[PDB]
């Protein structure tokens, strides 16, 4: 809902309902954000794509 | 998908008349022409009759020509078949089915399509004989391991066998029907379970004969 796949991965405190969850399609909402400690990911898209697959 | 209910099965004494009625829903009955086909127990597929989407064209099998009749009602979504002067060569399963056929038996709207609507119903069993419908008799037989239940003495064929309220689906062997010089039927249902399951767990078989109001259960074990 409010969580990009990366925030669910790291475990942003609002993104806890996703712990240990599986999926076939992840629907990333445009309203999502991050309400935790800032960070950036070298090769964001690569990590996102491999975690998705 | 499509859901139909079939009515009119049973036992009709020789020379008498049957009455079958297939009523379906979930599709547009008004468009499709229907077929009646029959299958003699054992093997064989014999076509019976065909009716268009309005009733204009009705055609019959040479084997039943002049002694059978087909009909349909579109307001009730019902297809029906009548046949008189029945003999032992007519006892069979009767399928109501939409078969591929010449186009004019179907509506103008459904001549061209990519799906080619099709369906068969379950069989409607009709048997001809002196109607002495009686209740079955069930005896459990028992001593790698193998145990079963044998049910004899029943004329109407639709017999079902379950095991312990229907849980065992493995190794279940249901045997084909057997006809003798008499008119009764016999049928056994067995299962092979290896020899380390006597005190581990013991089983009970169940025999359901619908057209006699029969539910007979019985435990299986050695003497």
């Amino acid at each position: 809902e409010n969580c990009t796949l990366i925030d669910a991965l790291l475990g942003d405190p609002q993104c806890d309902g996703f712990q240990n969850k599986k999926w076939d399609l992840f629907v990333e909402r445009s309203k999502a954000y991050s309400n935790c400690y800032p960070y950036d990911v070298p090769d964001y898209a690569s990590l996102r794509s491999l975690v998705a697959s | 998908q499509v859901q139909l209910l079939e009515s009119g099965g049973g036992v009709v004494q020789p020379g008498r008349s049957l009455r079958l009625s297939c009523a379906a829903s979930g599709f547009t009955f008004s468009n499709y022409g229907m077929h009646w086909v029959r299958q003699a127990p054992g093997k064989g597929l014999e076509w019976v009759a065909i009716i268009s989407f309005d009733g204009s064209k009705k055609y019959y099998a040479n084997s039943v020509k002049g002694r059978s009749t087909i009909s349909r009602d579109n307001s009730k979504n019902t297809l029906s078949l009548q046949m008189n002067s029945l003999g032992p060569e007519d006892t069979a399963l009767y399928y109501c089915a939409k078969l591929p056929s010449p186009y004019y038996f179907d509506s103008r709207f459904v001549w061209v399509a990519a799906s080619a609507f099709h369906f068969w119903g379950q069989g409607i069993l009709v048997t001809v004989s002196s109607a002495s419908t009686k209740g079955p008799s069930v005896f459990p037989l028992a001593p790698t391991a193998a145990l079963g239940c044998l049910v004899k003495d029943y004329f109407p064929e639709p017999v079902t066998v379950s095991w312990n309220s229907g849980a065992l689906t493995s190794g279940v062997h249901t045997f084909p029907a057997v006809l003798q010089s008499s008119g009764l039927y016999s049928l056994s249902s067995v299962v092979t379970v290896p020899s380390s399951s006597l005190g581990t767990q013991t089983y009970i078989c169940n025999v359901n004969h619908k057209p006699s109001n029969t539910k007979v259960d019985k435990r299986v074990e050695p003497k």
Binding site: - | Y103, W111, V112, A114
Partner: protein, 55 residues
């Protein structure tokens, strides 16, 4: 032909005749059946044949 026949609704190809005992119209069957089978095969090839692509 100069045009088509609109009154024909039990077929696609037909004969029209005018003899001393009246005029009449009747559609040919097997030609229409052979023309419907080919279009149905075309559709069956086209429709419903879609392959999966996941990621």
């Amino acid at each position: 032909i100069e045009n088509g026949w609109e009154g024909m609704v039990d077929g696609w190809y037909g004969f029209r005749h005018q003899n001393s005992e009246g005029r009449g119209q009747a559609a040919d069957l097997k030609s229409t059946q052979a023309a419907i089978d080919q279009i149905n095969g075309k559709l069956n090839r086209l429709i419903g044949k879609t392959n999966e692509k996941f990621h």
